[PDB]
């Protein structure tokens, strides 16, 4: 719905990286995997966390 | 009625059916099937006798034995002596829109029949149309790269559309019945005339007469099976 706070599998906080992940892509033009490695998310478990989140809240907040 | 039959190719999914008693009888339309809504036959009829159709009251089989019987929704309305003329025009006319695209026409060349259908409930799909020529040597698909880009410019502006594709004679809709009078290429490269030991074997184009090509084989599936990854690497059940 919203970034999850930690990697399901390792504990790494990952909830504090979504803003940035998305600024890394749209503002500084990185491909999704150099981006993720910039955030330090270098095991595949945390990668998948960022890489597959879907921000559904964004669509929830359009309702009044 | 429960079995998958060759003729459901591309119109219903070969995989999605519930288990048990419904097995087989409950189906789901392929991602790209549609179903006709019916359209009235009377211009077709009228066109036909503009083009030389002879009416049943004049027919004398003994004096025109070579003739092609012409049926429209299941009525014999008469006979014609050049169906190939007739048929090249009919198709032209449906590939520019003047006969509606969801109409079906078949000629059966050895049966000496030409059957057209304009009723609802027929299920259909689109295919590419493949034409000789060109000029450029072989049989080629009528869409080409420029058509695609007009497609994708439109996509990115979010005007060329689906329908532009039907109007221009590049794609046409085919129902099971007319599928029997065609020959379709599975990938556009079967038209052009050392392998990767890991790739699958495919057995070539032993074909110079395609009239069409599939848009994508992965459209034979339905909604659900379109979510399985690599279902071409799985046992069918």
């Amino acid at each position: 719905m919203i970034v999850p706070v930690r990697c399901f599998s390792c504990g790494k906080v990952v909830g504090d990286k979504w803003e940035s992940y998305l600024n890394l892509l749209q503002e500084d033009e990185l491909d999704e995997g150099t981006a993720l490695s910039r955030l330090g998310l270098k095991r595949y478990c945390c990668r998948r966390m960022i890489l597959t989140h879907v921000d559904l809240i964004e669509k929830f907040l359009r309702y009044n | 009625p429960r079995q998958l039959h060759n003729t459901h190719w591309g119109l219903v999914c070969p995989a999605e059916t519930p288990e048990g008693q419904a097995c087989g009888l409950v189906k789901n339309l392929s991602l790209m099937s549609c179903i006709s809504v019916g359209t009235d036959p009377m211009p077709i009829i009228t066109f036909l006798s503009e083009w030389g159709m002879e009416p049943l009251e004049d027919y004398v089989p003994h004096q025109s034995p070579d003739a092609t019987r012409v049926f429209v929704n299941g009525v014999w309305h008469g006979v014609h002596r050049n169906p190939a003329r007739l048929m090249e025009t009919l198709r032209t006319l449906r590939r520019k829109g003047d006969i509606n695209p969801e109409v079906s026409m078949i000629r059966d060349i050895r049966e000496k029949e030409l059957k057209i259908f304009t009723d609802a409930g027929r299920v259909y799909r689109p295919l590419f149309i493949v034409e000789d020529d060109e000029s450029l040597g072989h049989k080629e698909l009528k869409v080409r790269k420029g058509h695609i880009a007009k497609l994708m410019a439109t996509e990115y502006q979010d005007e060329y559309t689906w329908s532009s594709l039907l109007n221009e004679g590049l794609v046409e809709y085919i129902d099971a019945e007319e599928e029997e009078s065609i020959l379709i290429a599975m990938q556009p490269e079967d038209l052009e005339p050392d392998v990767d030991p890991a790739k699958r074997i495919r057995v070539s184009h032993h074909a110079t007469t395609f009239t069409h090509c599939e848009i994508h084989p992965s459209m034979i599936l339905g909604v659900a099976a379109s979510i399985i990854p690599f279902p071409d690497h799985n046992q069918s059940p």
Partner: protein
């Protein structure tokens, strides 16, 4: 190979009759008082093993049928190598899987049947 006759005046079918005195075959009608003599003495035939219909469909336009396979066989007539080919169109369980080829310049029909007993088709 019977060939079938009708009344000149009515168009109804004719039936055989023996001319009892002169020992000959007549066709008469059952409606008119028409009669005529018979063309042959064959009045009926029953083929248990039949070929009529092996070559059903060979039509002027056979070659524009895109379904048909094509081969580079040559004809006995044209020395042409543009054929279309099919199997027997009878539709028997008891058919052979021989090929009938259709020369697309001269329209001659020819088989791959090595034991060819057939003149015509």
């Amino acid at each position: 190979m019977t060939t079938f006759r009708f009344c000149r005046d009515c168009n109804n079918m004719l039936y055989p009759r023996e001319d009892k005195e002169n020992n000959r075959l007549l066709f008469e009608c059952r409606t008119c008082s028409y009669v005529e003599e018979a063309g042959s003495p064959l009045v009926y035939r029953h083929e248990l093993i039949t070929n009529i219909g092996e070559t059903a469909g060979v039509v002027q336009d056979i070659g524009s049928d895109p379904t048909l396979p094509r081969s580079d066989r040559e004809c006995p007539k044209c020395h042409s190598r543009e054929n279309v080919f099919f199997q027997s169109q009878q539709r028997r369980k008891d058919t052979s899987m021989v090929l009938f080829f259709v020369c697309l310049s001269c329209s001659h029909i020819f088989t791959s049947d090595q034991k060819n007993k057939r003149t015509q088709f």
